[PDB]
Amino acid sequence: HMASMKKKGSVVIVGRINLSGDTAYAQQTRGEEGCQETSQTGRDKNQVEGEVQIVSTATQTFLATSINGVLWTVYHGAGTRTIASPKGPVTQMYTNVDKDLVGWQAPQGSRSLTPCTCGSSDLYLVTRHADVIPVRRRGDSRGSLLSPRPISYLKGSSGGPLLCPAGHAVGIFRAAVSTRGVAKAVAFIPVESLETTM
Numbered sequence: 777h778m779a780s781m782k783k784k785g786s787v788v789i790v791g792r793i794n795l796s797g798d799t800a801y802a803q804q805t806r807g808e809e810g811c812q813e814t815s816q817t818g819r820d821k822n823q824v825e826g827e828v829q830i831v832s833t834a835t836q837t838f839l840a841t842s843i844n845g846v847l848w849t850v851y852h853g854a855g856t857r858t859i860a861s862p863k864g865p866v867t868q869m870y871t872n873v874d875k876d877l878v879g880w881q882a883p884q885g886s887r888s889l890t891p892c893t894c895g896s897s898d899l900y901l902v903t904r905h906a907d908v909i910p911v912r913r914r915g916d917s918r919g920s921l922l923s924p925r926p927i928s929y930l931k932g933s934s935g936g937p938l939l940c941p942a943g944h945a946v947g948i949f950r951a952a953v954s955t956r957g958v959a960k961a962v963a964f965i966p967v968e969s970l971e972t973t974m
């Protein structure tokens with residue numbers, strides 16, 4: 777009934793991937809209890825830092841990446857959800873189910889990656905465990921892992937970046953191609969398709 781109709785909560789930033797130093801490592805900034813409350817209220821007062829955020833809903837966790845002032849992630853994780861912010865829920869400014877893509881305005885305090893114009897095919901995928909995985913670009917939206925590994929190690933990393941050697945954003949990780957559970961290739965939204973969307 778209309779009176780009891782529920783509302784879905786906001787996506788919540790629960791951590792980040794620190795790429796500041798010589799060592800990449802994941803940091804948690806909010807635990808599950810505070811995440812659940814922040815998802816219901818949409819009010820997140822935690823300071824945001826960095827380029828790659830770890831984000832969560834009530835049921836899923838994945839990544840989100842700031843490029844050119846937009847925090848980008850996957851539609852299959854975020855759906856049409858708002859993201860929590862210090863002033864309350866923030867509505868998506870980009871939504872494209874056909875690309876598996878959504879975006880919100882980048883949060884105050886975040887740093888944005890620069891869109892790559894190098895035209896290089898030697899990429900690096902950043903996962904939610906702060907693994908930096910070499911990927912050879914194989915097409916507009918795909919790349920092969922130089923060292924395959926079980927898909928388990930990539931689960932939860934959709935929305936993370938593929939980067940060029942210079943640290944520019946080349947795309948947003950969206951799917952993994954596997955054989956017998958072994959990830960051999962990845963699919964991603966290329967930054968040009970984001971720059972198109974923008």
Ligand SMILES: COc1ccc2nc(C)c(O[C@@H]3C[C@H]4C(=O)N[C@]5(C(=O)NS(=O)(=O)C6(C)CC6)C[C@H]5/C=C\CCCCC[C@H](NC(=O)O[C@@H](C)C(F)(F)F)C(=O)N4C3)nc2c1
Nearest residue numbers: 836837838852853876927930931932933934950951952963
């Ligand atoms: C609902 O409206 C839409 C609109 C457009 C969509 N567009 C795609 C693309 C899609 O795909 C789905 C999800 C995605 C996936 O799993 N993403 C990763 C991930 O981590 N998600 S997540 O963070 O854990 C999560 C779920 C919390 C968000 C990186 C994976 C890591 C491991 C993979 C685990 C096994 C799933 C393999 C599958 N392979 C695939 O689809 O390959 C395509 C190219 C094929 F089939 F053609 F080869 C695949 O990767 N996904 C299957 N759902 C869409 C849904």
Ligand SMILES: [Zn+2]
Nearest residue numbers: 892894940944
């Ligand atoms: Zn580049």
